[PDB]
Amino acid sequence: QDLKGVWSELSKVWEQIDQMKEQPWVSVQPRKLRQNLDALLNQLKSFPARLRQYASYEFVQRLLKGYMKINMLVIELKSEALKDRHWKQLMKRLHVNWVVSELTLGQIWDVDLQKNEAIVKDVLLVAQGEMALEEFLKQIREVWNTYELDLVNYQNKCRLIRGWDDLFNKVKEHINSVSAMKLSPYYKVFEEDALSWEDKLNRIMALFDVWIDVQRRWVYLEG
Amino acid sequence: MTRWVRGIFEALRPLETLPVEGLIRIWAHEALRLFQDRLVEDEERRWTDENIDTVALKHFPNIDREKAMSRPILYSNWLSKDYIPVDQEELRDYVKARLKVFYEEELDVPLVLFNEVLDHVLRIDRIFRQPQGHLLLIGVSGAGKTTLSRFVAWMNGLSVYQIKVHRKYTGEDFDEDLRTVLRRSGCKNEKIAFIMDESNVLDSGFLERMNTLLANGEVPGLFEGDEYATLMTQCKEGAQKEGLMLDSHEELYKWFTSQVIRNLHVVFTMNPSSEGLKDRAATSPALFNRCVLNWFGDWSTEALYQVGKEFTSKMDLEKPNYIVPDYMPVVYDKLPQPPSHREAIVNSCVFVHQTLHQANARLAKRGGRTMAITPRHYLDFINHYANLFHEKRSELEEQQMHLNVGLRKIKETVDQVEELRRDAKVNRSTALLKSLSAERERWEKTSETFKNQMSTIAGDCLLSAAFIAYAGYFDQQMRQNLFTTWSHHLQQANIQFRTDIARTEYLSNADERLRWQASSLPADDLCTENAIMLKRFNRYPLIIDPSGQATEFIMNEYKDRKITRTSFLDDAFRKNLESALRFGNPLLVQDVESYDPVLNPVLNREVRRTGGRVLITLGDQDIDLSPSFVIFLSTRDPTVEFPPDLCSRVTFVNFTVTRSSLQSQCLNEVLKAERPDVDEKRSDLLKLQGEFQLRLRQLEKSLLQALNEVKGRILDDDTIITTLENLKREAAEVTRKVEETDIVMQEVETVSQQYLPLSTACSSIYFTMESLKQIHFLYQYSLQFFLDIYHNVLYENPNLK
């Protein structure tokens, strides 16, 4: 008769766990998940001692403990570093055919993230590296799309360019940084894009290295 | 005194009523929190403890001391909505729960709560609750500052702001940063913990703009111009949000100043007064007066014991048969008694730190160059001990499982040959069986030995882990002295450890040593140990190499990873460092004698996680730490005194020739050149460790490969015993040498002491040649000169023919 009691008192915990598992993966907030899991564990801790002897209660408590333990990897899986390519890599290595729009928290939960923590760590490491390279290229694009050549009037005849030191320092920094990015282990993904910017960067230098000269002599000759 | 009045006022403001004894208790608590924290020495704290009681009982007679002031005085606001006294255990439990939450929320690094860190948490929280509450945490490098401040700021919801000083970071940039944080704190009513560190407080010119903020909460002249109009608009918007209708600009500015007093806090973090080279020297006494000062100090024996127990609790350091010694040496007077194996192991782990501190003090006594020893050394030691324990136990378990599989397959082959005896091939099956069973018996005894190896693993890893963490800067002689001291202390505690441990052999396989020697590694005991330290490092290494061999070694080792050379003195250093940190290529930075402070967080691994973007501050920029990044700091100068700030952030690796190093090199050279038999018997004594047994069971691997490849064709000629005889020889051979491991050790000792005066003469001669510089500038001779002289004297000597 105590089997009925433990099943009835564990049914509510099962409904809440399944309702959490049915949540789509996009809407998951891991901090709210930790709050709900902590509420569930504290609810389980209040059961009568007669029920606690059973193996089902121990199994469910261990299950929630495991979900708490892998909550760290769940947080890391909500990282913005992960992209479609990294989700594909996770699917291939873990041998699971997920659908990113249709993915639910329960499918990731029941997949043995605890056992497979090494694969998850490797994929998120690759994601971090590729995110670093991507945001570096984003910085290049923003800077050079927003860079304006300063001009200062010269004897009311024209406006000559000022700030050669800053321009050449920025060009040197970006060219050196792209050349160093070419050595990165995560470079193959962004390769083509990097090459494009390299060309433009070199052209920029190949212009202004001439331009300052064509300025200086002219100024001298003007004087 | 005004801080005292403010503290009692904030304590009493939410309280509806008090008794006199509660007032005395709050008075004593504020006395301790304002005066006892700044003190450095323990006895001064005891004097303050007694004097608070004396003054209270003098000016408040007939008030019983036990109720009015109990020694464990704590006031906190987390347990209850009111600022009332609370018990130690409840606060311990709450802070432990919140810290375990903090692990998986902002930064995933364990943080142990010991008796001397909960107090600092409470002090930091207290200064956060006061108005105009600015804290100045001063203490040894490491020890929790910049980690406890962030932790308490996270707990209390204060958004942490840290200044990012660049080069050409003029005072206007600091002015703008102060404007932004002041607007956030006052107009938007967002509490901020304004954390400042000595690294970015290198210039004292901007630290006198902050004094006005600390003393008054408003810095006039910041918002002059249209900024005044915008701030007035936002300030009146905020006042309307709070429900107060204000018109005059002066009253609005006063309310803004009051909000800045309430909200914005400043947390300075400094090291003790060793920054004489800095422009600060000892920073201005005005800065000390304005803030509330907190002496962090260094972890005591109890703190080391507790932070060791909770880091080595996941390890299986349990031995049911641990015979406690009759008389044990103890660093922790409050050890559980009779101590168990885990207790004894952690006490020995604290012995390591205590003996290293004593050794450094002794080296200071004899005028030698000392290096700062900090808590991060202990944390690195414990981490290395855990990783090494796990690695060695995993290796031994793998080998034991493989040998059990081999025994299973041997029994299967016995069954197969028994089936073949059911059937002139049959007669010689009596021989193969006579081989097979013997092999089986051999493997059985091998399995037994593995059990003994289990019983010896723990202490061994300890004696190696400390060596990887602590004794990296010291010379070879003091390295051996420290190792002997640690081994003797382990022996005293009945912890089982190998008698004749070889550090360089226990921590590296022969393939790795061969690879290093293929690279530009001078093959010496000190150099091999240093090369191991460049493999098993948690913190990035500092390579002190006057010869310059180690830089080439690092370059050749990491050539596949496209390591690039840089120096601090190079103009294009910061950008190269940015690229290396951003993309993950390894880096070698030379001339760290002029150590830039911008590398302080990078060595400390102060990652700030925001979504998938893992930022680290460098100058103006916040750059993305790639996983692959590794940095090696280098020094051609062997005469350098690094700051204690850098010592805790880096592990030292000394490639410096000394008396004992050259003595050992010369002695090994003579033993190789003139008594090569003893050289063989010495290299064979360091090959009775992993090398020979690894080969012996790697032959069992090929045996088992060619043992179950059977379909009744095992008796092709009944001559498979050859493959089983090739293992019959070597086993007995490596059973002879294991038996002849005391005769050989004594023999090499006796033969090496004979050739020792030559080695001492060699060391003295070379160091005299090095001394020749200060007689005349031309009298400069490399160590290659002396070694070439010795090669001529040993090998190309016509008098020896």
Ligand SMILES: Nc1ncnc2c1ncn2[C@@H]1O[C@H](COP(=O)(O)OP(=O)(O)NP(=O)(O)O)[C@@H](O)[C@H]1O
């Ligand atoms: N109580 C603790 N338990 C465990 N690890 C700790 C503890 N306190 C500090 N640490 C670790 O010690 C390292 C350095 O701590 P930290 O206090 O930030 O150094 P620091 O005091 O800021 N050095 P500095 O900033 O130059 O004055 C970090 O890896 C922390 O996680």
